[PDB]
C-alpha cells in the first residue's frame, strides 16, 4: 500500500530570455520508488497545457534509478510577452497519488500561497 505523495524538487524560479533556448531540471522522489511517468507533467493552473503566454514551454520525463528526471526546455519566441507566470510540476506515483491536486493549485493561485512543485517562470 502507498498513501504518501511523491515530492518534486524544482528550481523556485526559472528565467528565460526572448529569442533564446533554455533548459532546466526538476526531480521527483517517492516512498515507493515507482511512478506514473505519463501522468507527470509541467502545466499551468487551468488545464494540462503549458499555458497562455508560455505555449513554448516544453518538458520530457525519464526515470533514473529511484527518481524521475523532468527536463524543462524550449525556445522563447522573440515577440513573447515579458512577464512572470506561476507554473506547476505535477507528478503521479504508481499508486495514483499526486504531489499537488487540482484543488490545491487553484487555492494556491488565488490565495498567493505555494504548493510542492510550483515555480515562477520569468521571461526577460
Ligand atoms: Ca507514494
Numbering used by the authors: 398 to 521
Task: Give me lines lifted from the publication on this model.
Many streptococci adhere to protein-attached carbohydrates expressed on cell surfaces using Siglec-like binding regions (SLBRs). Siglec-like binding regions (SLBRs) are among the streptococcal adhesive modules that bind sialoglycans. SLBRs contain two adjacent modules: a Siglec domain, which shares some features with mammalian Siglecs, and a Unique domain13 with no close homologs outside of the family. The conserved sialic acid-recognition motif governs general specificity while sequence diversity in surrounding loop regions allows the SLBR to select between related sialoglycans.
Only the crystallization conditions for SLBRHsa and the isolated Siglec domain of SLBRGspB (SLBRGspB-Siglec) supported sialoglycan binding. Distinct loops in SLBRHsa and SLBRGspB showed the largest conformational differences between the unbound and sialoglycan-bound structures. In the sTa-bound structure of SLBRGspB-Siglec, the helix of the FG loop is rotated 10° as compared to the unliganded conformation. Moreover, temperature factor analysis suggests that these loops have high flexibility in the absence of ligand.
